[PDB]
User: What shape does this take?
Amino acid sequence: SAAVKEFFGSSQLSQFMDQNNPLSEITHKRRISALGPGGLTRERAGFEV
Amino acid sequence: IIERADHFGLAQLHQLRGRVGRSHHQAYAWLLTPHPKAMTTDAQKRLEAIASLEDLGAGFALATHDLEIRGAGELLGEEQSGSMETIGFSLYMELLENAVDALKAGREVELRMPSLLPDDFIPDVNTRLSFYKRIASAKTENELEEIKVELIDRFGLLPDPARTLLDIARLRQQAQKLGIRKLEGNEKGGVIEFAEKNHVNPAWLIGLLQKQPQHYRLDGPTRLKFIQDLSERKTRIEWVRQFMRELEENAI
DNA sequence: GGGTATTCGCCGCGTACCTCTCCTAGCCCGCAAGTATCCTATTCCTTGCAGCGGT
DNA sequence: ACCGCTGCAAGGAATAGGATACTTGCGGGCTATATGGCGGCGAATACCC
RNA sequence: GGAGAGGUA
Assistant: This one.
């Protein structure tokens, strides 16, 4: 329970939903991030990425 | 001589000790116990208390110790011994006086199922008792309907115990006219105990017996055993209703 | 020894503001709440062998 | 003077409910193991003379 | 008060 609940409720990928548009929800759901666990960091990325 | 006195209340131990003597003679009272480390702590406490008090007239100090060690129970309810978070005496006297004053200016088809008016239905007791009297004394289905309408008007929805009580009153009213003195029922079946002079059509009764021998068997002069898997209270109620209805349609 | 090279580890990487969520794991101990055996009432019946009328 | 029948015993289970102690369910209230960033630099070794 | 996520110039 802890192992799963901690991840879903609090993780760097389960984020709030922008909802002030249908378009907002759609485009947000299709997002493709490169950060997170196992991913590079926002503030140490070179131009190539 | 108590062979194993560890598991006995203080009241029981004192009472047993009170059985010896009763005369001019000197009487002993041995309370044999197991090895003390095997005894439970409360057994040690009770034994040390009972052996602590060996005097004439000590039955009241012991009683007042058993109280305030086990505590007085629900003053208005059951569970005489124990804390039980009982209501206070000031509240009890107020409620008793209130009920008294309100009362002064006033003034079988058993089926092994609850058939009553639950407390959540009618809080005060006098109204409950009055409606019990009214339902039990009502001699017509019309008056039972009037009682039902009064109940719905004054308290709203009828709990299952209330509806079972009302339909049991109706069934008893029908059976009183018919002649079945005691109609019984349980989960497995039931017994019809007719009167000395019932109004059951003999030919139709024999027809029922010979069409369903398994469900109608005469065991005695007026005892008819029927076997039915009466799992549900509602289904039992309606099966009995239809049984008695088909009976009265053929009544002679 | 010593001048040189090579490695290793430390230090450093913009401002201001807005929205949101979430801040230890596990044990223990006492409360307290819910249960298996013992006597005196109750409703539940199903057998065993001798009398016994009656012929 | 033989026999099927009736009746007088025998044979006990299941609950109520006041006891006695077991069994535990719990909740508050405690204790106690990495793998996508470089750049610069100075200090610590390596080494081959 | 502190962390993390997102967002604006």
User: Anything to note?
Assistant: Chains B and A do not touch (no CB pair under 8 Å). The beta strands of chain B are 180-183, 189-194, 217-218, 223-227. The first strand of chain B starts at residue 180 and ends at 183. The CA atoms of residues 1 and 12 of chain B lie 14 Å apart.
